[PDB]
Every structure is written in structure tokens, then in C-alpha cells.
């Protein structure tokens, strides 16, 4: 994993010069995909979620995030009415800083057990970043990056 | 590493998940990705038979320490034995 | 750290729970004190076009590593990546 040390004013990926004094100097930041100039409307964003089966979801916490101008909430059902998404396990909640929530509802049949991102990005819930969409709870789309903060 | 085990198999055909050989091509994105069984790199150890028998015996010897450690610990799924070993090593050497 | 993004946001607005202020004043007994959404503090970091608009490309470049690490491991909720990085750093120099 590319660890990004901070210079006095800049960033360098990675030397006895680089020093850190405790674990609090290690900061995991979650940056939304909207900060990368990506389209944010529902029809274009919905195309970035697909359905797959045979791969388990893995979740990684992140310490800090950014405000989400548009954060998404998903609740879809195939016409049999079954909840295609997994339930949100305890310890996962909505993304805590959102300007406006898109309460997307869909009828698209689920060919796979889980729904993954098509860009390799993570779904942000609270202080956790997972690889699968969860029912009801509001999530952002973003990536987790590791840094060292200055003394 | 003296085998108290009645019979040592002199070679092992092993599989690993930490090695990167499972998805050299293919893709990293889980959406276009291997199944749960494609995360495995194969390997073979015809050579070093004495090493393998000694490793068998080490597995035999370390079992009861693992059982005692598990029985004492309240955490059901313990993934921190290697991290604890690194702590023990480096703490023992550079602690004081 | 060359910015290959189409458009990059020059400023950042970060919410963070790791401040030790949190419910400064207020209370810390869990029965009293804030709700689940009141812990967070916030700040506006727009220090330079070096850190910001570079962190985004750092995330683009580290997402593959994080995906491979998650596809390798078997622990559903990972919280010790930062601890593992700290141990790797500290133990690299004092290898003995």
C-alpha cells in the first residue's frame, strides 16, 4: 500500500528523515469520487453499480472523510419482492455529513448475491469503507488513502 | 525437530493467498474479478524433505500452546498471533 | 503524484472523530452526552494545491493495493491496517 508521508508543505509517497511519534500521526482519509470530477446524477451513477456472486464483502475503517454534496441511499427489489441487497450489519450506519440524499429505488433484477462498484472504489458508511452496497443506509462513493500528519 | 510423529511426508503441495500470483492478469476490481477459489497460488516442495519433517514436528509441538492460548482468550476469531509475535520479538530486543 | 484526474477539487472539508475534544464540555457518560452523529468535529483544509488535488491521485493509486489486500485477507472488518503499517515501518529500521 502506498503510504503518503507529508512534507512541510507537500506530499511524497513511500529514510530516517521521516519521523513519527505515535499512532495518532497515522491518518486514514476517505475522499469521495465527486472530488474527482465524476458525474453525480442518478442515471449515470447507477450504471457504476453491478451485481456479482461468489466474492465476499470486505470492510475497512477510515478515520476521516469529506462532506458529500450528493450521497446515495439504495433500496431495490426484484419483482418477486426479495431484498437483493444484504442487510446492514450492526456497526454500520449512514454517511455522517451529507448535503442531500438520493433515495434511489430500483426494480432491476439481481443476477448476483452482492452489488459491487465498477470503478474499484469503496462505499462509505460512517467510519467504514466496504465493497458492497447495503440496504436502507446512506452511503457515499469514495476511496481510502493513508497519510502521516505533521508533528 | 526430531520427529516423534510416526510418519513424515517428505514433500508438500501447498497453496498460498498472500502471494500476488493469483491475479497477475484478470483484474483487481471485485466486480470483474476471480471467485473465492481464485485467490490461491500453488506451490510444490519436493526438495528439503528434512525441513518438511521438522516442520511437521514443529506443528505437533506447538499445538497445545495454541490450544491453551485460544482457551484463555475471549476473542473467538484471533488474527493477531503474528502481530503479537512481532511485538514480542522486537519488544524483547529493543524494549528497555 | 502527478494529477491525472479530469477535474480535481482544490479545497477539502473534512469531518473527523479523532480530535479528543469531541463532546468538549457537554458530557462523556454514554447515558448522557451526544447522539451517534454528534461526536464529529469538522474543518476546512484548503492549504495548497499540493496536498489537496494530490491526495485524490494518491487515493487513485492506493485503491488497487487496498483491493488486493482485502481480497487476500479473510477478516470481514479490518481495523489493523494502520497498526500493521506502523509495525512495518518501526520494524524495518531495527531489523535485528
Amino acid at each position, epitope marked *: 500500500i502506498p503510504l503518503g508521508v507529508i512534507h512541510n508543505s507537500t506530499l511524497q509517497v513511500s529514510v530516517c528523515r521521516d519521523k513519527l511519534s505515535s499512532t495518532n500521526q497515522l491518518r486514514s482519509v476517505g475522499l469521495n469520487l465527486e472530488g474527482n470530477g465524476v458525474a453525480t446524477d442518478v442515471p449515470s451513477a447507477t450504471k457504476r453499480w453491478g*451485481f456479482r456472486s461468489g466474492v465476499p464483502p470486505k470492510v475497512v475503517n477510515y478515520e476521516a472523510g469529506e462532506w458529500a454534496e450528493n450521497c446515495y441511499n439504495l433500496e431495490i427489489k426484484k419483482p418477486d419482492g426479495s431484498e437483493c441487497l444484504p442487510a446492514a450489519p450492526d456497526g454500520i450506519r449512514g454517511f455522517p455529513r451529507c448535503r442531500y440524499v438520493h433515495k434511489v429505488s430500483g426494480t432491476g433484477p439481481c443476477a448476483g448475491d452482492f452489488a459491487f462498484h465498477k470503478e474499484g472504489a469503496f462505499f462509505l458508511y460512517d467510519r467504514l469503507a466496504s465493497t458492497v452496497i447495503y440496504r436502507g443506509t446512506t452511503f457515499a462513493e469514495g476511496v481510502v488513502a493513508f497519510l502521516i500528519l505533521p508533528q | 525437530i526430531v520427529n516423534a510423529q510416526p510418519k513424515c511426508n517428505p514433500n508438500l503441495h501447498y497453496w498460498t493467498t498472500q502471494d500476488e500470483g493469483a491475479a*497477475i*492478469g*484478470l*483484474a*483487481w*476490481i471485485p466486480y*470483474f474479478g476471480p471467485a473465492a477459489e481464485g485467490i490461491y497460488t500453488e506451490g510444490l516442495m519436493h526438495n528439503q524433505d528434512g525441513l518438511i519433517c521438522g516442520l511437521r514436528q514443529l506443528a505437533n509441538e506447538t499445538t497445545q500452546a495454541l490450544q491453551l492460548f485460544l482457551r484463555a482468550t475471549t476473542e473467538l476469531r484471533t488474527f493477531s498471533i503474528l502481530n503479537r509475535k512481532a511485538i514480542d520479538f522486537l519488544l524483547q530486543r529493543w524494549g528497555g | 503524484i502527478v494529477n491525472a484526474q479530469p477535474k480535481c477539487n482544490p479545497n477539502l472539508h473534512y469531518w473527523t472523530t479523532q480530535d479528543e475534544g469531541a463532546a468538549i464540555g457537554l458530557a462523556w457518560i454514554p447515558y448522557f452526552g451526544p447522539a451517534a452523529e454528534g461526536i464529529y468535529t469538522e474543518g476546512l483544509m484548503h492549504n495548497q494545491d499540493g496536498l489537496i488535488c494530490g491526495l485524490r491521485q494518491l487515493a487513485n493509486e492506493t485503491t488497487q493495493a487496498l483491493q488486493l489486500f482485502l481480497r487476500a485477507t479473510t477478516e470481514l472488518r479490518t481495523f489493523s491496517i494502520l497498526n500493521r503499517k506502523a509495525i512495518d515501518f518501526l520494524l524495518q529500521r531495527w531489523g535485528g
Partner: single-chain antibody
Amino acid sequence: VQLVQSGAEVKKPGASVKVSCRTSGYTFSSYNIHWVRQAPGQGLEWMGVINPYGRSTTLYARRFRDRVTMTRDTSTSTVYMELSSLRSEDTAVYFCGRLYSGAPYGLDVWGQGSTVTDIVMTQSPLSLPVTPGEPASISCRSSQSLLHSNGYNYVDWYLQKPGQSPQLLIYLGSSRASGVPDRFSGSGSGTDFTLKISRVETEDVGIYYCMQGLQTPLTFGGGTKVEIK
């Protein structure tokens, strides 16, 4: 975005070969570099894969293991192959391509190369000579179904003009690549994959390939060379 390869070279069977591929225009650290060999009369054979990531991990075809070595350098953002003994059987042009490591989006850019001394997919038609302006159909058959649990077939179709680098036509089963005319239309049954050429023109004559990305080794098809006649 461009890829350049090493210049023309002729070597002794004893002498090894050193072939350099240089990228330009994209983040070299993310895209896989795939190396393929074009030997006339045998189509193409996938030489190997290099991942230009920090660990610089590599993979080679079984037939070429232990004889070919691949190494990248981030200073010039380049990749290098060194062989061991270039036999006369290997007098074939060497092709460097880049593929997005994030997904089997198909090989995008190609080079030229010059070196002078498994899922079997058999294309059913060997050749289709036809007058221009007449639609055509061409398919290749796969022993193992290439359908993925995602639902996207991983068959990729490429077109090689005579004496030029292979050009990507179809990726992800049926999606059309950037810059390709809308005339070509690919369809995939999951085991036998077909494509309709809307109208055949003079430029579109050449050899057609199907390669699968579902499971290493990435095997290329026999290649149907369509000429106007």
C-alpha cells in the same frame, strides 16, 4: 497515448534478446503490460504479463517459463524482456500492449517489434473471401464457456491489418471500443461467439482474432483473414 518498442534486430541462437517497450501519455503504474508474439502461420501466442506496480509482479506462459524474464524501470516508465536462447522457431515479431489492470477492457494500444534469428478457442471459418459491400458473419468457438458470474463475456476481438499492429474492435463480449466504426456488431452466446460485419470495406480486410481474459493463459484464436475477392 502511445507505445513504442525496440527497433529491428537479428540475433544468433546462442545470443539472448533484449526488447524494450516505452509508454507515453498515461499513468504507467496502473496499466498491465501484456507481451504477445506474432509468428506467421501460427497466429499469436500470449508471451506474458507484467504488472507495473510496486512489487513489479510478473507471469509467463508455461511453454516459455524459465527462459524469458521481464523487468520494469519506473525512471523511464519502461519495460524490458530478456530471453535466454532465441531459437529459429521464435523468429516472430514481438508486440507490446497495455490493458487496464482494473478490468478486462481489452488490449488498447500496440507496438511493432522485430526479433529475427488452457482454454482452446478455435475459429470455425478459416477464411471469408467476399466482394465489398456485402455483410458478413464470423465466429470463434471456445471449449469452455467464457461467461462470467458478472454476466459479461470476456471474449475480446482484434483486427490486424496486413503489416501493422493489431487493432482492437470488440471488448467485454459485445461493447464497442473507442474509435471503431459502428459497422461491426459482436454478439456472444457464452460458448460460441459471433460478429456481424455490416459492410466490408477495403481497409477492414485483415486477420481477425478472439482472445479470452477469463483465465490465464489468455489464449488467442486461430485468426480468420478476410480478404476482398
